[PDB]
Write a protein that binds this ligand. Structure first.
Ligand SMILES: [Ca+2]
Ligand SMILES: [Ca+2]
Ligand SMILES: [Cl-]
Length: 123
């Protein structure tokens, strides 16, 4: 679920404000997105979007009920490292890995404030 993704991002990037910093950035960071990612961070968001799309089509995820935004899973944060729990069901495990991959990606790429609030003309 989103507030677990927020937690993951704080795990890797304690100085971030994840629902602020990684929303409305580039062509992909935020609800929706299409076109050409403008930088590596935006590409992390592209990847995450694609992962959430796959999660929504997984046989093991019930339509709507198991959606990635509201489907809570189990994870932990240890020394700024994320673990997805083996206690998760298959749908939850998939979603947890989407979020883990993105939080790690966000932590490994530069943040370019000039890419905030891009108009879709740029995509
Ligand atoms: Ca997006
Ligand atoms: Ca759940
Ligand atoms: Cl990690």
């Amino acid at each position: 679920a989103l507030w677990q993704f927020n937690g993951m991002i704080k795990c890797k990037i304690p100085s971030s404000e994840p629902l602020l910093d990684f929303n409305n950035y580039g062509c992909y960071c935020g609800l929706g997105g299409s076109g050409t990612p403008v930088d590596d961070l935006d590409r992390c968001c592209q990847t995450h979007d694609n992962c959430y799309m796959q999660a929504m089509k997984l046989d093991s995820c019930k339509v709507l009920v198991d959606n990635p935004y509201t489907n809570n899973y189990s994870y932990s944060c240890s020394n700024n490292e994320i673990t997805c729990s083996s206690e998760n069901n298959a749908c939850e495990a998939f979603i947890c890995n989407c979020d883990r991959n993105a939080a790690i990606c966000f932590s490994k790429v530069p943040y370019n404030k000039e890419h905030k609030n891009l108009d879709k003309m740029n995509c």
